[model samples]
Target: EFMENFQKVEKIGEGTYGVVYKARNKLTGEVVALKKIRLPSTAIREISLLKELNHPNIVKLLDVIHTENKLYLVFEFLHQDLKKFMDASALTGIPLPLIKSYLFQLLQGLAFCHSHRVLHRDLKPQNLLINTEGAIKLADFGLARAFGVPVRTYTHEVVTLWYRAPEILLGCKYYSTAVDIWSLGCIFAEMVTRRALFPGDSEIDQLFRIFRTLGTPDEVVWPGVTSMPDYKPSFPKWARQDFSKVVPPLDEDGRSLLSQMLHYDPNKRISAKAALAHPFFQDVTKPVPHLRL
Candidate 1:
């Protein structure tokens, strides 16, 4: 009803819960992201969940505008998404220290998310909004889920597998908070090498790519791999490899943390809290004083 309050700059991207637009507050000349969702089911879940979350790294919900057949979520606008930034920079390369800074902020956000028991099932570069200050803002809460809020349970099929944890590809999903940790590892790997570490054409290909790098999982390695929903008798046994060799640029402690992040056993993967304290992040400064600012 109040169109004059905000002016739409242009369509920016497609939101899973709805369409998205870059907008500005007409009165104050402030930029923001406007998400318009026609389907309220997803909108309800997102709005309800985001209202309880408050963090600098995690995206904030500025306001909500309701109309007869629409729901608009106004968010603080950061014009760049990591996907676009990577498209231009990844081909050339990002500074080692800058990678550490961005990765640190993301882990901070991820840590906050897990602190509240919310899992951002969809953790791709597309949802990581970046500001000019060199800060990464975790966005796309519309697709996130709070653990065990419903006894019915949700499956791993809901999210994309590029960043999907191995357990997620074939796990019980009941105790899989480690899925996001794996996602963090995947993103971290990509950031380090400027390449999709496990880019897969299919689920099997995804597993193979992961296997090809980190080696195939087994009951001995993961403890419960044999009993997983998709595990079978003749799973291939790929040669195991160290993560340090794969991301050559990362230092010893950085690669060590990355390795722990992708552990096969969901229980063994590093929690965001532990990851924040990992030696890889000892030198990172808050707000990343040395970033593109």
Candidate 2:
């Protein structure tokens, strides 16, 4: 058992439902993270879904050891996570090259999951992990599930509010991988600018914030834009704010790609695979890693 290799070191981060420990693996003499799933039904579903995911940028669910009442998910211990990186930046900004690399890695992982028809419902800086090589890995598969799927009219209570897509905010019942892509866009903007690109004080405020930039959706852009359950909030014309002002630092190509991801229509939202293939990424110092989409 590689378990013998890991010596429990210290508690690193904890969330509402789980506790994460930093440990040293005895077998490989490497440091790894061990997460204990204490959430009842949530833990079971996440474990089942994670068991089906295998991607380099996505945290490998190395082992699952269970006791009668608790489940332990072993993960490759990365030195720091996206949130840490964001914080380490003196709360200022990230290098252009590093941002592209991180974004590329994020898309690679997401493309893998999207190809397998998965949705990373939650995508926040904290969930993005950085390995020893400065490579980004998507971690925390607690809320993600198999998307582009037809099970039933699912609830829209999945994603983190700040990273959520506009379609989701409008109460669209059938969301696709676009949700993740939108989040990636938001995260990218956050990474580059060191602040939320669109910070909304409330749900409606969030939608309006999106509207202020990209503008509102019409039936033309989003076939059923006005039909969503919570789509009644009124706002001025779409594309109200110029994006350049929002992130004066982001280059044209980056902003162009960002716009596509932030499109109000789920049907039009960019895909992780398409994002990698975008021209904006053509000059990336490091070739975007192929995600095998």
Candidate 3:
């Protein structure tokens, strides 16, 4: 019920669904980011999703205010995103140690969401926020929603083109949190190279990128692929191809993790919890330094 505790700062960035503003909370002596949403439809899920989500690695939804056709979401302010840090001139390519921790925390958050039966749907570098001290948070939930039911139709427009899972690309009516894991796999590869691992100009091209690098899926791995309403085109061949050339920067452990997440069959894909215990993370000697800081 109180008002005007936050002083406007500057526009930080924009997302697929809204604009973000940097703000200061004089009342709490805290700095925060205020995300402004345009349509009421987009804002509707904000409260519902935030109420169900409560975890350290996940961004906490602090407050929500609606007025005059605009909804403002209050969030603890972070200086930059993981994507920005990955690009900063000061840092080398996202170090293996840093990526391992980041990915682990990300999976921890993903595991929470998955257990609660929520799907982030969108997982990419920019969707990940980082505090100045390096704590990571999965920030944007504009595309997230509770998903479960066999053979249902949701928007194919859910995830970003580059990070979309094969099932979504092939137009699977019903999907699962594994879709987010696929995108995480893509982000993982990108972090290692400091470049986009899967850059697809369009839907058709995105699938091609995945197929080309990882090879096409067969009915045994992914049943009823050709029956999807939007399914089209085929290579009619199985090629082992070369993952080394495609994901050249990664070490063996990194490649193994990526392969696990990028598996074509959602049922067989590695769960987030299992990924946390994978050898890549087990090999790390220290807690991800950035995370501790």
Candidate 4:
């Protein structure tokens, strides 16, 4: 039924877990992203969790196809992701208003996830799908999970290194929603500058890069710094860089919001809901509280 119902047009994307194809419904001619997923725990998690999510900012899961040798997850087709969109705008650079619009949508999607107790462990420009009409939809749930208490040890090896939070980098096995916020903070900074905020090639280098900008952490600031399983004091002390200098294009409110999101103390990091209501976005058109028609 799957093959008879839809015609695969082209390969759209590939990831560690699966290959995604651009496909069209044979009967209705509707476009879709058909993800050929291995029937593993990750695929099950993605399918189950995504099925429960219903938000405009999240990629819509249309159907599930099962076969003896394969399984496919269908999603609404989006023309491009944030990375492709930004790459296309490289010559002109992304306008400030568009940047705000993108960030707003991203935050709204993230907020909905957090509200649902889901954490998008991997959030990069590529995972943020953007249509031609300037709407942002969060995608790629293979690394995501439903996060809740009583706190358990989650593997520290989740997010992409460049966007990883300091706690996760320091080997804090037990974490919470703060990890997602950190990734979002990195994405936010990248959107504003049209460049990676911290493009660290290795784990050690990644921690150092983050420290170089946010300053070295201490027991006084982070409170439980030395207790982390992988904590090391070998790095040199570095003072925090001014946000204005790092993200010169952002206004004062924008800088403030970014700083809060990037806070070294995960407890101190701003929530997505709070970030949406921040002063930086006050002049921008707010996203509707519910999905728009």
Quick one: best TM-score, which candidate? 4
TM-score of 1: 0.86
TM-score for all models, in order of appearance: 0.86, 0.83, 0.85, 0.87
Task: Give the Cα lDDT of each candidate.
Answer: 0.76, 0.74, 0.73, 0.77
lDDT of 4 by residue, 1-293 (tens): 56667755688866434677899998789999887756455555566657778799999887766676777778888877877777777676677887788888888988898887777777788878876566889886434442211121222223357877889889888767888889988988887887899998778889999989989999877989878877777778999899998987889998999999998888889999999989999888533221121
Q: In model 1, what lDDT does residue 171 have?
A: 51
lDDT (10s digit) by residue, model 2, range 1-293: 43355664678866423677888777677777887655256546656667669877888777776666777778887767777767777445677887898888889898898888777777888788776566788886534442222222223223346787887778777768888998899998898788887777677878878887776777777887777898774656665567788777998999899888877767777888888999988877643322211
**If ranked by TM-score, best first, what sequence of candidates would result?**
4, 1, 3, 2
Off by over 4 Å in 4: 1-4, 39-46, 146-159, 286-293
Error of 1 at 91 (Å): 4.5
Model 2 stretches with alpha carbons more than 4 Å out: 1-6, 25-30, 40-46, 146-160, 233-239, 287-293
Cα lDDT of model 3 overall? 0.73
Output the TM-score of candidate 3: 0.85
Candidate 2 worst ten-residue window by lDDT: 146-155
lDDT of 1 by residue, 9-87 (tens): 6888666556688888988898888877553465566566676688889888888666777778888888678878777
Query: Distance (Å) between predicted and true CA of 94, model 3?
Result: 1.8
Question: On residues 188-242, what C-alpha lDDT tens digit does candidate 3 reach at each position?
Answer: 8887777787788778788887777777777767787767767665554547566
Looking at model 4, report the run of 10 residues with the lowest lDDT sum.
Answer: 147-156
Candidate 3: list runs displaced more than 4 Å.
1-5, 40-46, 89-91, 146-160, 233-238, 285-293
